[PDB]
Each structure stands twice: as C-alpha cells, then as structure tokens.
Amino acid sequence: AELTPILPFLFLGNEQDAQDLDTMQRLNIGYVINVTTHLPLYHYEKGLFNYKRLPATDSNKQNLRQYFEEAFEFIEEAHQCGKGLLIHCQAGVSRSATIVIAYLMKHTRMTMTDAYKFVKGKRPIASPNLNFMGQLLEFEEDLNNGV
C-alpha cells in the first residue's frame, strides 16, 4: 500500500490503501474522504476516524465541482485540528486526484497546471478524465475572476 503524501497532512490513495489500517495509524490519519458511490467506509465500525463520502462516479458526466468546497472544509478541519487526512477513490485516482488538485488551486496560489503536475509528480498514475479536467480549468477561471 502506497499512500502518496501530497502534503504533510494530505495523502492520496486508492481502494486498497484505505484498507491498510496499520499504515494509516502510523501516519496519524484522523480523517478520511471516500470519493466513490459503492466502496465501503473501511474501518467505520472501529470508531477510529471521522469520515466524509463524496458519492461520485469516474464518468464523463459526474460533477465533482459541487463537492469542491465541501471537501476543502474537511481538509481545513484536519489542518486546524492537527490530524492527517486520506482522500481515496479507486485505482486510477481520477476522481480523488481532481479534488486534491483543486484544494491546491484554492488555498495555495498555484495555477491549475502547476498544481496538476505537482500531484502528477508525486503520484504518476494520476489521470483525471477530461470531464474533471474541464471542471478544474473552469475552477481556475472562476477563482481568477474573484470567485
């Protein structure tokens, strides 16, 4: 299991990485975001972490932009509460990486292109679909227009 640490408090992963509970406990993760509709909240019953589900699909019509602001709050609650946070979708990390790249665009002064390749460098498998990439490009233009 490889939980790519995009920041010190931010980890990107896939289906399997959220199951590696030993790994997550070493990283002091206390927050988890499941960006899928069908995967379970692994380790939910254990009472270990707080959870947030962004029920989305790796499709060309799925709107992740709606969840952008909702997930940013979960990440700033972790940073303000001094705890790690793992966002994971499935395999190709198309969905989960789009939200990560967007978190960097809103709070980090980075461009969409700069942030996209920052995450691409740490996790090479990142391949947000063009539907998600258009949202990311539109989120840049919005943010640049005082939005």
UniProtKB/Swiss-Prot annotation:
Residues 2-145 form the Tyrosine-protein phosphatase domain. It is found in: Cytoplasm; Nucleus. GO terms for cellular component: cytoplasm; cytosol; nucleoplasm; nucleus. GO terms for biological process: dephosphorylation; negative regulation of cell migration; negative regulation of epithelial cell migration; negative regulation of epithelial cell proliferation; negative regulation of epithelium regeneration; negative regulation of ERK1 and ERK2 cascade; negative regulation of JNK cascade; negative regulation of oligodendrocyte differentiation. Keywords: Cytoplasm, Hydrolase, Nucleus, Protein phosphatase. Its main location: cytoplasm. Expressed in keratinocytes (at protein level). Detected in brain. One of its GO terms (molecular function) is phosphatase activity. It comes from the Eukaryota. The active site is at residue 89. Belongs to the protein-tyrosine phosphatase family. Non-receptor class dual specificity subfamily. Protein phosphatase involved in the inactivation of MAP kinases. Has a specificity for the MAPK11/MAPK12/MAPK13/MAPK14 subfamily. It preferably dephosphorylates p38. Monomer. Interacts with MAPK14. This is Dual specificity protein phosphatase 10. It comes from Homo sapiens (Human). The chain holds residues 320 to 466 of 482 of the full protein.
